[PDB]
């Protein structure tokens, strides 16, 4: 057992990140002249480690994310969090909009496209409608209209 007092520092200070960063750039310059089209070319790899330079790295040299809510690492989890909840909330609200306007079960196996695009467009701004339905209790059915089992 060996205590790690400093598990994380800036990646640009870690020498195992400088190992990796030069080892990736050398592979990107190897494929630029006398090479093959790759996902990370020489300018793509420069920008990749331009982003990782001000990140936190462990001793292996790989970036580690901080998800505690701290705001110098808000791009690590907090900003992808708002982007997720907007897009996932849009798809959830759009299905809820389409379900209420459904003619029947045939609208569930044959998608009514101008109804579906409109619900998917109206779902895009879902917190314009959802939170005024969320404080009113309009988001939920009363308890004596929802089936339950014996107790």
């Amino acid at each position: 057992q060996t205590q790690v007092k400093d598990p994380l520092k800036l990646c640009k200070d870690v020498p195992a990140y400088q190992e990796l960063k030069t080892q990736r750039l050398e592979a990107a310059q190897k494929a630029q002249a006398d090479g093959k089209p790759v996902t990370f070319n020489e300018a793509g790899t420069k920008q990749k480690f331009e982003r990782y330079d001000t990140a936190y790295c462990g001793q292996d040299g790989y970036p580690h994310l901080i998800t505690s809510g701290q705001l110098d690492r808000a791009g690590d989890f907090l900003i992808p969090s708002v982007l997720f909840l907007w897009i996932a909330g849009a798809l959830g609200w759009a299905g809820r909009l389409y379900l209420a306007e459904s003619k029947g079960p045939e609208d569930e196996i044959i998608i009514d496209l101008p109804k579906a695009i409109k619900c998917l467009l109206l779902g895009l701004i879902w917190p314009v409608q959802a939170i005024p339905e969320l404080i009113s209790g309009k988001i939920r059915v009363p308890e004596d209209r929802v089936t339950i089992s014996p107790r």
């Binding site: 004596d144 209209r145 929802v146 089936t147 339950i148 014996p150």
Partner: protein, 62 residues
């Protein structure tokens, strides 16, 4: 209760408990225990959409 009215189910073992069905038939006779026939939007686990209830198991919501 009469034919056509929307009614809630108080039969707890019913699939449609606390749901709203439509009265399709009320038996005009005595001696019949469960005289009111209710039709529903949801089939149960057997694909059945109707059942018979007493008036004591129904709540008129209309």
């Amino acid at each position: 209760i009469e034919r056509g009215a929307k009614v809630r189910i108080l039969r707890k073992e019913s699939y449609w408990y606390r749901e709203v069905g439509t009265v399709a038939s009320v038996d005009k006779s005595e001696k019949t225990i469960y005289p009111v026939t209710v039709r529903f939007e949801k089939v149960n686990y057997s694909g059945i959409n109707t059942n018979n209830f007493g008036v004591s198991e129904l709540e008129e919501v209309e």
